[PDB]
Assembly symmetry: C3
Homo-oligomer: 133 residues x 3
């Protein structure tokens, strides 16, 4: 047994911009490393990890994969499609993490001006240890 998780977000609530995506269904979490209420994976086992997400919203969808590791990770994945269209954006990375480092996803508004309302977001976020540091 090693860290391995799969968490799902499927709900009516809008997902706030620039805050960690939270999830309402835990499919797997072997080492109990993920808190679906905060949206954070928190590393207990130091090592190299794989993370990947698959997510959709109506209209433009931008998500960042982020970490509190040093140096920090901030990777953006954006579908700049039309308002009426809903697509699945996927992104992810192989990351080296220390004990206590956090990893999450976060929506942002990749374009447009002030005053945009957050939107519903379907999301599957997956991750697992590749090897122990």
């Amino acid at each position: 047994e090693k860290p391995a998780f799969s968490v799902l977000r499927n709900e009516t609530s809008q997902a706030q911009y620039k805050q960690p995506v939270t999830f309402n269904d835990k499919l797997s979490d072997a080492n109990d490393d993920f808190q679906i209420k905060t949206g954070y994976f928190t590393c207990k086992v130091p090592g190299v990890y794989y993370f990947v997400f698959h997510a959709s919203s109506e209209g433009r969808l931008c998500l960042r994969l982020k970490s509190t590791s040093a140096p920090p990770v901030s990777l953006s994945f954006c579908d700049f499609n039309s308002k009426s269209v809903s697509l699945v954006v996927s992104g992810g990375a192989v990351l080296t993490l220390l004990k206590g480092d956090k990893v999450w996803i976060e929506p942002f508004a990749g374009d447009g001006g002030v005053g945009q309302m957050p939107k519903r977001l379907y999301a599957v976020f997956n991750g697992f240890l590749i090897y122990r540091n």
Copy 2:
């Protein structure tokens, strides 16, 4: 370790609500996959990673499914115009028992051709 990668690249249409079948096997270390049925069947109980990347012209809805307990049903849809063909990706980390099947199947959220790569491997043994 169980580990596979299978490819659908063909002229036939992919029927709705049936497992996607494949014509090319790139990898199948433990011979867990039958491309003619579209099923991965677990031999080694444990925690697995699964991912697909697929494209069709126009709207494409795919479900990752299992006969594990309780059964998985995860949808991934591109709702785009009929002129546009795009890649939809989806997948999960699943806990499997021996004999559990895992597959992908299209659904309408007139079938079409479907390009698909479906990948999977054991993360750890139970």
Copy 3:
């Protein structure tokens, strides 16, 4: 420690057709298997590997995962969208590699453009 890498292309220059995408930032490379200047992963440890990329470019984007294995891999992933739209295409595979085998991604015309790309890979088991 296992072969495991994550490389990032986030720059200005266009990614030419039919040659390996090169990268300007190495996020992870545990076994020093990736050379970002060439765009190649080169296998040192024989075994079964997982490879995956996520990339975006303005308008149409076609990317191909390739290897010099026997037999060689050529797996295409295409987003056939309009000119004013940037989307993320993803693709990948599980591949069996011998020492010296090379793996990479390359753009093709399904007018080159800049390309944001993250390319990841890791050993699943040793052969």
